[PDB]
C-alpha cells in the first residue's frame, strides 16, 4: 500500500509548490491527487488554471505545477493556482519534484522486504535525513560517498539497508590462440597465465584461451589487453614455438 507525506507534514503551507497528476476534468476544474504533499486531493477552479486550446492541454495523465493559496487544516482541503507561478522558479520546482520522487522510490524496497508499514519507515528515515540536512536525496548521496547520516538513527533492519546500498551501487572479451611445436610448452603457458590473469581467464578446449578483462572507465581495457598480448608474444619466441593473436 502506497501512502504517507513526502516532506514533513500531511497538509501543505502557504506559497509552497505542488505537482499534480490529473485523472478527470471539466466539472469544477481539477480536484486531483498530489505528488509533492501526500495523496489527499487538491482542487483548482476553472480560472486560476489558465495562464494564456484550454480543454486539450491537460485532460488525463499529464502533470501540472501549481502554487498553494488556501489551506483548511481540519481533514484535507487544499487550494491550488497555476497562473501565479513564474517561469524562473519552474525548473527549481521540477527539480524538487524529481528529488521527492527519488526519495519515494528509495522508500519502497524496505516496504517490500520486511512486510512492515511504509509510513513508519518514512518517519524513521525523515528524522536524521530530511530534517537536519535539508533534502533526503542529497543526504543519501553523502552517505553513499562517506557514511555519516545513517549513524544518527539505529537500524531495525540492517539487511534492508545492505540491499538498498547494493541497489545504489565492464567485461571485455579476448581470444589468444596457442599452437606451439617446441620441446616444453605447458610451463610456458603457465608462465603466460601468471602474467595475463592478474581478471577472469577460463579454459575451454586446447588451442583456444578465453579471457575477460574488467575495465573501470570503459576505455581502460585496451591498455592491459595489449600488454598481455605483448607478454604472450615475448613468452613463446625464445623456446621455439608459435602463438597467434586474431
Amino acid at each position: 500500500t502506497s501512502h504517507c507525506r513526502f516532506y514533513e507534514n500531511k497538509y501543505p503551507e502557504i506559497d509552497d509548490i505542488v505537482m499534480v497528476n490529473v485523472q478527470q476534468i471539466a466539472e469544477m476544474g481539477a480536484y486531483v491527487k498530489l505528488l509533492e504533499y501526500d495523496n489527499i486531493e487538491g482542487m483548482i477552479l476553472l480560472s486560476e488554471l489558465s495562464r494564456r486550446s484550454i480543454q486539450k492541454l491537460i485532460r488525463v495523465g499529464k502533470n501540472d505545477v501549481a502554487v498553494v493559496l488556501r489551506v483548511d487544516k481540519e481533514k484535507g482541503y487544499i487550494d491550488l493556482s497555476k497562473r501565479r507561478v513564474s517561469s524562473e522558479d519552474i525548473i527549481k520546482c521540477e527539480e524538487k519534484y524529481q528529488k521527492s520522487k527519488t526519495v519515494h522510490s528509495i522508500l519502497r524496497y524496505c516496504a517490500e522486504k520486511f512486510q512492515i508499514p511504509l509510513e513508519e519507515l518514512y518517519k524513521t528515515i525523515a528524522w536524521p535525513l530530511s530534517r537536519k540536512f535539508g533534502h533526503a536525496y542529497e543526504a543519501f548521496k553523502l552517505s553513499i560517498i562517506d557514511e555519516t547520516v545513517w549513524e544518527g538513527i539505529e537500524p531495525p533492519s540492517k539487511d534492508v539497508l545492505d540491499e538498498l546500498k547494493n541497489y545504489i551501487s565492464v567485461k571485455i572479451r579476448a581470444d589468444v590462440e596457442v599452437s606451439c611445436f617446441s620441446y616444453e610448452g605447458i610451463d610456458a603457458i603457465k608462465d603466460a597465465l601468471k602474467s595475463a590473469e592478474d581478471v577472469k581467464v577460463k579454459l575451454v578446449a586446447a588451442p583456444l584461451y578465453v579471457l575477460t578483462t574488467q575495465a573501470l572507465d570503459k576505455q581502460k581495457g585496451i591498455e592491459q589487453l595489449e600488454s598481455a598480448i605483448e607478454k604472450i608474444t615475448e613468452v613463446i619466441t625464445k623456446y621455439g614455438g608459435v602463438c597467434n593473436i586474431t
Binding site: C180, G185, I186, P207
Partner: protein
C-alpha cells in the same frame, strides 16, 4: 591380483555396419574410444580384455569376470594373460589407419555376417593385407547367426572353407558367436590360448616405438593453474621402457614460416605412462600405452601425429626423402566390387605407399623389373627393413596392388 599390462596385440577386422565395436564390448566391457579433443586422432580405438582360466569342460574354460561364480566351481581364477584390442574400421574410404594398426598386430580376428552376401571384396583385401604383414594366426568369426537358417549357416561355412585354401593361413579355426546376445565367447577365449603363442622378446634389442593416437588432458570448468601434459598414445613392438627417459619423435616439425628449416626431432621427457587403467613404472612391449610426455597439449590435438616413429636418446636412425623399394605385384585387384587386371607401373604417377604406419604419397622415377625408386612429398624414416603395403588410384578411391621391402 597383480596389475600386469598388455602382453600381445590382437586386432579385429570386418566391414561397415557389420559389428566390430559391439563384439569388442561383448569380449571385454570397457566401451571403445570412437563410436573433438579426447580420443579423436585416428580410426582405431582402445580396448582391453582379460584372460583368466579356471582349471580344476568341453569348451567352457575361460571367463570374463575376475570372480568364478557362473560355471560351478567357487575357486579363484588363475592368471594367464592380459591383452589389448586394436579395433580397425573396414570402410572403403579409410584404410590407412587399418594399415597402421596391422604393423603392430600379432594376432588377427576376421568378422563376416551371415545374412549378407558370401563373397565380399573388402574382407578379402583385409585378409590379403594380413597375409602380407607377417601374420599367420587368424581366427574366423561368424557374426549374425541368430537371424539365419539351420542349413544356410552350414552352407556359408562350406563356402568359406572352399574360399580359404590357397592362402598362407592353413589351419584357421572357425567360431560362430553372437554380439548382441552375448554367447559362445568362452570358446573364443580358449582358442586365443590354444592357437596363438607369444613370440620371444628380450631386453637386448634397441627401443622402437610407434605412435598411433594423440591425447590432450584438459577439463572444462577447472582453472588453468591445474594443467596436465601432452599424452602420446603409442604402441611398442621392441624395446622395454621405464619411467625417466628422453624420447624423440623422428620425422620433424615446422615451427617457423622465409628461412630454411634446421630444427631437430621433437625431444620430450616421459612424465607418466598410461597402461590399461592405472599408471605403471615398466613398459612391456606388445601393447598400446598412452605415453604422457613433456610435449605440448596443443600438438596432441587431432590429425597431426598419425603413424610416426619414436626413439630413445642414444640411438640414431636414418631419414629418407628418396626410397629404394623391391616390389611384387598381384594378378587381379582386390577391393573392387567385378574384378580388374593389374597394369604395369607407369613413370610419374601419384601413388600411396604405406611403410609400416606412415601414410605417404610417392611418385615413381625409374622402373626396371623388381627394383623401384620413389620420391616422397612428406618425410619418412627407415630403421631396419619394414613391411610395406602399396596402393594405387584407378577409379575414384585407393586400391591395393601388392607388397614391397626396403633394400638398405
Amino acid at each position: 591380483i597383480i596389475n600386469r599390462q598388455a602382453t600381445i596385440n590382437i586386432g579385429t577386422i570386418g566391414h561397415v555396419a557389420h559389428g566390430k565395436s559391439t563384439v569388442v564390448r561383448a569380449i571385454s566391457g570397457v566401451q571403445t574410444v570412437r563410436f573433438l579433443e579426447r580420443n579423436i586422432t585416428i580410426k582405431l580405438g582402445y580396448a582391453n580384455a582379460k584372460i583368466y582360466k579356471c582349471q580344476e569342460s568341453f569348451k567352457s574354460d575361460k571367463e570374463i569376470s575376475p570372480k568364478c561364480q557362473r560355471p560351478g566351481c567357487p575357486g579363484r581364477y588363475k592368471l594367464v594373460r592380459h591383452v589389448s584390442f586394436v579395433d580397425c574400421p573396414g570402410h572403403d574410404i579409410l584404410m590407412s589407419t587399418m594399415l597402421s594398426g596391422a604393423a603392430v598386430m600379432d594376432a588377427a580376428l576376421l568378422l563376416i555376417a551371415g545374412n549378407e552376401s558370401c563373397p565380399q571384396p573388402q574382407t578379402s583385401e583385409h585378409l590379403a593385407a594380413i597375409e602380407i604383414m607377417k601374420l599367420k594366426h587368424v581366427i574366423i568369426l561368424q557374426n549374425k547367426v541368430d537371424l539365419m537358417r539351420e542349413e544356410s549357416a552350414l552352407e556359408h561355412q562350406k563356402s568359406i572353407l572352399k574360399f580359404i585354401r590357397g592362402t598362407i593361413a592353413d589351419g584357421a579355426p572357425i567360431v560362430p558367436i553372437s554380439a548382441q546376445l552375448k554367447y559362445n565367447i568362452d570358446a573364443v577365449n580358449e582358442f586365443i590360448v590354444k592357437t596363438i603363442p607369444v613370440p620371444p622378446r628380450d631386453f637386448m634389442i634397441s627401443p622402437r616405438l610407434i605412435v598411433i593416437r594423440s591425447f590432450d588432458v584438459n577439463k572444462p570448468g577447472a582453472e588453468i593453474e591445474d594443467l596436465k601434459g601432452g599424452v602420446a598414445g603409442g604402441s611398442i613392438l621392441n624395446g622395454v621402457f621405464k619411467l625417466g627417459d628422453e624420447i624423440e619423435i623422428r620425422p620433424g616439425i615446422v615451427t617457423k614460416d622465409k628461412g630454411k628449416i634446421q630444427c631437430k626431432p621433437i625431444f620430450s621427457n616421459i612424465v607418466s605412462l598410461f597402461a590399461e587403467q592405472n599408471d605403471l613404472k615398466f613398459a612391456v612391449p606388445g601393447g598400446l600405452i598412452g605415453v604422457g610426455t613433456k610435449v605440448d597439449p596443443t600438438l596432441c590435438r587431432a590429425d597431426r601425429l598419425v603413424g610416426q616413429v619414436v626413439g630413445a636418446k642414444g640411438h640414431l636412425p636414418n631419414i629418407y626423402t628418396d626410397i629404394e623399394i623391391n616390389y611384387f605385384l598381384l594378378r587381379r585387384l582386390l577391393g573392387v566390387k567385378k574384378q580388374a587386371k593389374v597394369r604395369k607401373l607407369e613413370p610419374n604417377e601419384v601413388l600411396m605407399v604405406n611403410i609400416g604406419s606412415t601414410a605417404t604419397g610417392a611418385r615413381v622415377v625409374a622402373v626396371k623389373a623388381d627394383m623401384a625408386r620413389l620420391q616422397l612429398t612428406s618425410p619418412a624414416c627407415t630403421e631396419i627393413n619394414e613391411k610395406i603395403a602399396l596402393s594405387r588410384r584407378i577409379e575414384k578411391h585407393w586400391r591395393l596392388i601388392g607388397w614391397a621391402t626396403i633394400k638398405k
